[PDB]
Design a protein around this nucleic acid. Structure first.
Ligand SMILES: [Ca+2]
Ligand SMILES: [Ca+2]
Ligand SMILES: [Ca+2]
Length: 295
DNA sequence: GGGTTTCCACTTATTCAACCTTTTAGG
DNA sequence: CCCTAAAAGGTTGAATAAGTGGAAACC
């Protein structure tokens, strides 16, 4: 079982809303629809999608390839459980707009309007603003649907447990080894990062006030660019970040990386990172965390 | 048969997470 | 000058997000 604010936070990170408008000869209006919500994680974290499936009592889980597992909810009657949860515990990222389009599509299909050509047209207008918008095929079939206008989402973090769910998705507990010509040769630096597209710059900035520490780093790769909420000062990590997530527990395999992160934190707090044996212990923990974990 | 929904194997594109080094701050 | 800590500054690839083909299940 999972906490409802924890789940929305995770759904802001991972999770996605789908609207399929598929050409289908056997449909009277020539199109069939499929609506729902889905999350795709590494096989690593299939436990998360089992706890969500069990808390909602809805969703089917299936492999999304060799390295990935998927939780998909499409059965139309079952999306009421999705909508009921997100109405009481709403998303706060730009995905909240994708959710509202999804809810608008729900009302279309609930009123059986998707079986009318006009209802398909409204669904194509909803799809045009949803996620990556219209397909080439749907653009060709509907050259009049042009608005890719996205509503702007701006909400505050509604709950401590929300950030714990979001950090379970976009968080990273990293142990950096700054190599130098010193006697030890390396400086151990704990880094806590939360990554997000520049779509939610104001939400990323708000973390600095919400947690009372950190700063924002802008990264880019060719046409794409994102942000990072970064904490590198150790006193903030020891007094704020670790006590925060120790009281609002994370979920998934990323939790085990946080526990090892705290193990390194106790060692540096004791100045053991200045020694040869203490620095070797930190390296053995860093090797077994994150991409080095044995499962 | 004439339609509609749901499931499941699977793909694609990118936004992530995780990993690096060099430099500056601060005592 | 000495010292380590914190910040600045990237790159990378895959776990994500988002979507697709096909067809069994349904009405
Ligand atoms: Ca995300
Ligand atoms: Ca994640
Ligand atoms: Ca993510």
């Amino acid at each position: 079982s999972i906490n409802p604010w924890i789940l929305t936070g995770f759904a802001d990170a991972e999770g996605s809303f789908l609207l399929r408008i598929r050409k289908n000869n056997k449909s009277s209006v020539g199109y069939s629809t499929e609506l729902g919500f889905q999350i795709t994680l590494h096989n690593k974290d299939k436990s998360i999608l089992e706890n969500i499936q069990s808390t909602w009592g809805v969703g089917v889980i299936a492999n999304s390839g060799d390295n990935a597992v998927s939780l998909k909810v499409t059965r139309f009657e079952d999306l009421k459980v999705i909508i009921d949860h997100f109405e009481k515990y709403p998303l706060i990222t730009q995905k909240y707009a994708d959710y509202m389009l999804f809810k608008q599509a729900f009302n279309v299909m609930e009123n059986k309007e998707h079986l009318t050509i006009e209802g398909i047209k409204e669904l194509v207008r909803i799809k045009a603003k949803l996620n990556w918008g219209l397909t080439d095929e749907l653009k060709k079939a509907f050259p009049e649907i042009i608005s890719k206008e996205r509503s702007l989402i701006n909400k505050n973090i509604p709950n401590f447990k929300w950030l714990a769910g979001f950090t379970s998705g976009e968080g990273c507990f990293f142990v950096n080894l700054i190599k130098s010509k010193s006697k030890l040769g390396v400086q151990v630096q704990l880094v806590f990062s939360i990554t997000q597209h520049i779509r939610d710059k104001n939400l990323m900035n708000s973390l600095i006030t919400y947690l009372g520490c950190g700063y924002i780093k802008k990264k880019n790769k060719s046409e794409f660019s994102w942000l990072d909420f970064v904490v590198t000062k150790f006193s903030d990590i020891r007094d704020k970040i670790i006590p925060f997530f120790q009281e609002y527990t994370l979920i998934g395999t990323k939790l085990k990386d946080f526990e090892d992160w705290c193990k390194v934190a106790k060692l540096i707090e004791e100045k053991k990172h200045l020694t040869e044996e203490g620095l070797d212990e930190i390296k053995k923990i860093k090797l077994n965390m994150n991409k080095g974990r044995v499962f």
